[PDB]
């Protein structure tokens, strides 16, 4: 069975997610508008990403144990995982119907061609789409989804982590909660090797992270592209 501590952890992570992910996408109006006539989708998508960093941080703060870490380690962890959690949380809007991210209206519906209109290439976009499909196929329960995001954030192997023993202990408590949840609450056949398939997604995210960071570096070396970013995006991703 799920212990009462494990039930608590799930309860908090569900709530923390409901409080940082608005499924009506109402705030999207406040973004610089999408242009599909260059890098015409860069202003819109930088604002979307910037907004999403803030939400990921809000989610992170509420992870049981996260607040016992130093502010230094909190920083390393959020800085390296932000892109990954944005990719994960975006699965909620992703749809296999047309391989797009559907945020409630045609204006806020993003496809392969919109992402390339933000200065990215297929070297990132094709594996990102593949990631989104494989993840959607897992048909995760909300409980598994929020647990996966939290485990991704609290990873002990990120470069620059000082107290790695403590980061691993916080994560172990989440990993164990996830494994037990799958065994007690996820009925076969869906549950088939479900944990190991979720952990593999965390591997895939490392590759996507490395490729995004490479193209981000190339995109942002140009001061005219950098001008189109936000201060938070520049602080978190670089330069």
């Amino acid at each position: 069975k799920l212990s009462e501590e494990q039930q608590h952890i799930i309860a908090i992570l569900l709530d923390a997610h409901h409080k940082t992910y608005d499924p009506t996408y109402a705030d999207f109006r406040d973004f610089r508008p999408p242009v599909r006539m260059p890098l015409s989708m860069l202003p819109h998508l930088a604002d979307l990403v910037s907004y999403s960093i803030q939400k990921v941080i809000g989610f992170a703060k509420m992870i049981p144990g996260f607040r016992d870490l130093t502010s230094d380690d909190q920083i390393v962890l959020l800085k390296s995982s932000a892109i990954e959690v944005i990719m994960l949380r975006s699965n909620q809007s992703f749809t296999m119907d047309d391989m797009s991210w559907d945020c409630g209206s045609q204006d806020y519906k993003y496809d392969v061609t919109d992402v390339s209109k933000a200065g990215h290439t297929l070297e990132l976009i094709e594996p990102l789409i593949k990631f989104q499909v494989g993840l959607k196929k897992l048909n995760l329960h909300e409980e598994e989804h929020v647990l996966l995001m939290a485990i991704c954030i609290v990873s002990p192997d990120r470069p620059g982590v000082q107290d790695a023993k403590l980061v691993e202990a916080i994560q172990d408590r989440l990993s164990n909660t996830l494994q037990t949840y799958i065994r007690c609450r996820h009925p076969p056949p869906g549950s088939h090797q479900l944990y190991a398939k979720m952990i593999q997604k965390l591997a895939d995210l490392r590759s996507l992270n490395e490729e995004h960071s490479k193209q981000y570096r190339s995109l942002s070396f140009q001061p005219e592209n950098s001008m189109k970013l936000t201060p938070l995006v520049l602080e978190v991703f670089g330069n």
Binding site: I75, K79, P231, E235
Partner: peptide, 11 residues
């Protein structure tokens, strides 16, 4: 180093 915005958002 120096992440003043990230540090503000964290608390």
């Amino acid at each position: 180093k120096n992440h003043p915005m990230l540090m503000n958002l964290l608390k």
